[PDB]
Design a binder for this molecule. Structure first.
Ligand code: HEC
Ligand code: HEC
Ligand code: HEC
Ligand code: HEC
Ligand code: HEC
Ligand code: HEC
Length: 159
């Protein structure tokens, strides 16, 4: 009712709850209204934007409330990681990214990717660009993880 849902394409929504913030600021709506949240035609701020001080990040910095830049504090807002993301493109079977595989493999880290503009800042990145270190390529280069230059079947289906 007073809980606002922030829907995400590949994960459960993050739910902003007024109750706990009101008990915190003593119903002073002025703290967050028409200053922090214009709530008129907002974009979908990214976590990096929040790290810059936008959205929830205007407070969740570590000083006032837990920071949005803490791998151990993501659970404070997000329930989990996400559901398996399926990538579609012409020329190969669906490429699938799973967290069940990766997170437990990176000691539970999250910002390694989510706060890495070279790993998340793209849209329909190609294998060429992955080779130059973009997206999956930032780690699948035979140093960190198996190279993206080959191993097609390890990521793509029907291969
Ligand atoms: C052998 C070297 C491979 C072939 C042939 C292809 N891949 Fe990949 N791949 C993966 C993902 C998650 C994506 C999508 C990323 C995004 O869209 O942002 C891709 C994309 C492609 C594409 C489309 C772009 C292009 O034409 O270059 C094709 C046709 C494609 N891939 C063919 C993931 C991975 C990966 C996991 C680390 C590996 C090893 C490969 N891809 C290997 C090949
Ligand atoms: C790189 C190896 C990653 C690590 C480590 C973590 N995540 Fe992840 N996550 C990654 C990808 C490839 C994707 C899809 C990217 C996209 O275009 O959306 C995701 C997705 C999520 C999401 C969904 C975001 C959305 O739907 O808008 C969330 C909420 C998310 N990831 C959270 C998350 C957490 C909490 C992690 C630590 C336990 C974590 N991810 C690690 C890549 C990577
Ligand atoms: C910061 C901690 C907040 C305080 C204090 C209050 N509100 Fe708020 N409100 C806040 C956010 C992050 C949002 C989500 C806006 C968005 O961009 O999606 C909201 C939303 C509302 C709404 C709209 C509800 C909806 O349509 O989902 C209303 C009607 C609203 N807020 C009222 C309200 C009142 C009256 C407050 C004091 C009693 C108040 N808010 C405080 C953030 C915060
Ligand atoms: C509550 C203060 C949050 C904490 C702490 C974390 N996230 Fe978050 N995340 C939150 C919201 C409200 C939203 C949507 C904001 C909007 O305007 O739409 C999100 C969104 C993300 C996304 C998608 C966008 C992006 O940056 O890629 C992801 C992938 C996500 N959040 C991941 C994430 C991680 C890994 C966190 C820990 C470092 C993290 N979030 C903490 C609110 C909050
Ligand atoms: C400052 C003006 C705030 C803004 C903007 C947002 N939050 Fe916040 N949050 C703030 C404080 C000072 C606290 C209180 C202390 C506590 O630990 O409870 C919080 C707390 C939360 C919590 C924790 C709730 C709990 O059960 O303890 C969550 C999950 C949270 N905040 C989420 C959240 C989101 C998603 C916001 C942006 C959409 C957001 N907060 C903004 C102060 C402020
Ligand atoms: C570094 C943070 C990574 C990024 C970015 C992505 N992956 Fe990854 N991947 C990484 C590691 C550490 C490992 C371990 C490899 C090993 O065997 O030592 C992996 C593993 C995978 C796998 C193998 C899964 C399994 O067989 O259980 C796949 C299929 C895979 N990774 C796919 C993948 C895709 C599609 C990515 C981009 C969206 C991606 N990974 C990013 C580290 C990292």
């Amino acid at each position: 009712t007073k809980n606002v849902p922030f829907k995400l394409k590949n994960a459960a929504p993050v739910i902003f709850s007024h109750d706990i913030h009101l008990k915190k600021y003593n119903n002073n709506c002025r703290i967050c209204h028409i200053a922090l949240f214009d709530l008129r035609k907002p974009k979908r701020y990214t976590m990096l934007d929040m790290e810059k001080g936008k959205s929830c990040g205007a407070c969740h910095t570590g000083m006032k409330a837990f920071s949005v830049a803490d791998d151990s504090q993501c659970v404070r807002c997000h329930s989990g990681s996400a559901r398996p993301v399926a990538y579609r493109m012409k020329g190969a079977g669906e490429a699938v990214f799973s967290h069940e595989v990766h997170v437990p493999m990176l000691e539970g880290k999250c910002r390694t990717c989510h706060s890495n503009r070279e790993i998340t800042g793209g849209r329909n990145v190609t294998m060429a660009q992955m080779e130059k270190g973009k997206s999956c390529g930032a780690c699948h280069n035979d140093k960190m993880a198996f190279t993206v230059a080959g191993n097609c079947g390890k990521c793509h289906k029907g291969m």
